[PDB]
Design a protein around this ligand. Structure first.
Ligand SMILES: [Ca+2]
Ligand SMILES: [Ca+2]
Ligand SMILES: [Ca+2]
Ligand SMILES: [Ca+2]
Lengths: 277, 277
């Protein structure tokens, strides 16, 4: 049971309890306002307490995708959008400037609220801010954070890729090609992220989707099943053999493995041309 | 360099080369049509080859977010939307039914194009489809794929969380709370996903965002800096000490560590009241 404020690109959800001046709590790394709710119990006699789920977290939901650039460590999109969210929330809840407390990265949102929308701040508390930009050694801390994040994300993706590799039962010609890594750290990372997306959002949904053999017999005349010559014994060939066994739909052998259309493009083309020429 | 077809929820990007009847290549696990360009070069004198970046991949781009339900293994949203993308693309390029070849999971898209939009299909090829739904004992293969994906994603997340934990120089009280398990397996994983989002899309961007000390001095009488009593020696306290050193803005000590507001909510509230009530 949370309140909603619809904003450009997101539905912002927040908790609210109590009476008095508005006091907005901006969460840090956990992103959600439930973490303030025991504190809110202590304050509801003297403040109208508002604990926000920031738009990328919790019960808040995006209505437009994040820009592709938000993964750049130099992007200012999210922090500025979060600060605008707090300012429009303040404005919906009172006509007088409100109290604001942010913790950790949420204290950084708070600082951007004060910088860009000072008119909404009556008083503000920055609880243990980890901002480094104005520090004498800001370049060191920025580089250190960047190395830490890269290490965490890289080790997690590498473990996922290693475990994926442990399950793979694939043909040698495909394994050669599947092992070719991109030429930059960023491109390898993108390959890993793409694999993780396919695993979570595609393989189960598509391989158990609603197709029956009756869907194929209705138009059997249009269909050709293709098995690679270099991928024999693999599970997808067994699928084609079953379709063919039960429908009579023809199997055509074609050069290469599961990736035969890039392994042996000339031979693959020759078969397609025979099939459909 | 690619062509663009704007559809509901996405800009669909595709390679187009050649002459003659349209032939649409639907990519499998890599999601992108560049993998077919060598084959396209072999075929372009005989077919107008169209090689698609499916809408979640490559140069295609979503204009609305995926439904939260898409991570459910029984969701049919993406496979059906992919099939509709192909049928709309076919209708935009040819008045007559077209040739289609899909590979692997892209051949499952092709099956749904034939099922739901047979009027765009002249001939179709299924290259090594991995669909199990109509196979005898389909449930074995479904359960195996679900176990595989679960093991990959969760072992990757756990390694990332492990590596994150090794980098933390944090106070006893905060670690004790970080170390407390979430009640559910779903809640564990959600905490892990939230941490990975914060790492990639929040910490570097916010901690090196454009705040200067001048921004604080301009409204110094509005601001209170807060240091936990149980997190002494932590980096965020050094930040507050520097701001105070440079601006005169006061530091207030407050019970707890970095998570003091939920560790010791009455003490935290008591200080906020002495501050603002
Ligand atoms: Ca959510
Ligand atoms: Ca490693
Ligand atoms: Ca894209
Ligand atoms: Ca079945």
């Amino acid at each position: 049971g949370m309140e909603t404020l619809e904003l450009q690109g997101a539905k912002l959800r927040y908790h609210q309890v109590g009476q008095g001046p508005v006091l907005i709590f901006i969460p840090g790394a956990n992103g959600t306002g439930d973490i303030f709710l025991p504190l809110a119990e202590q304050l509801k006699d003297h403040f109208t307490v508002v604990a926000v789920d920031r738009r990328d977290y919790g019960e808040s939901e995006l209505t437009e995708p994040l820009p592709d650039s938000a993964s750049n460590p130099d992007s200012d999109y999210r922090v500025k959008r979060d600060a605008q969210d707090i300012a429009e929330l303040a404005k919906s809840l009172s006509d007088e400037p409100v109290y604001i407390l942010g913790s950790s990265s949420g204290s950084i949102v708070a600082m951007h609220v004060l910088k860009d929308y000072p008119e909404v701040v009556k008083k503000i508390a920055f609880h243990e801010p980890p901002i480094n930009t104005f520090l004498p050694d800001s370049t060191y801390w920025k580089d250190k954070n960047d190395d830490i994040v890269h290490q965490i994300l890289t080790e997690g993706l590498e473990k996922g890729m290693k475990t994926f590799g442990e399950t793979l039962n694939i043909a040698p010609i495909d394994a050669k090609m599947m092992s070719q890594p991109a030429d930059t750290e960023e491109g390898r990372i993108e390959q890993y992220k793409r694999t993780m997306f396919w695993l979570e959002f595609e393989i189960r949904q598509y391989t158990h989707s609603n197709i029956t053999l009756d869907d194929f017999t209705k138009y059997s005349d249009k269909i050709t099943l293709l098995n690679g010559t270099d991928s024999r014994g693999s599970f997808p060939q067994d699928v084609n053999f079953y379709i063919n066994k039960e429908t009579g739909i023809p199997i055509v052998d074609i050069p290469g493995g599961h990736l035969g259309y890039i392994q042996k493009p000339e031979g693959f083309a020759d078969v397609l041309l025979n099939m459909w020429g």
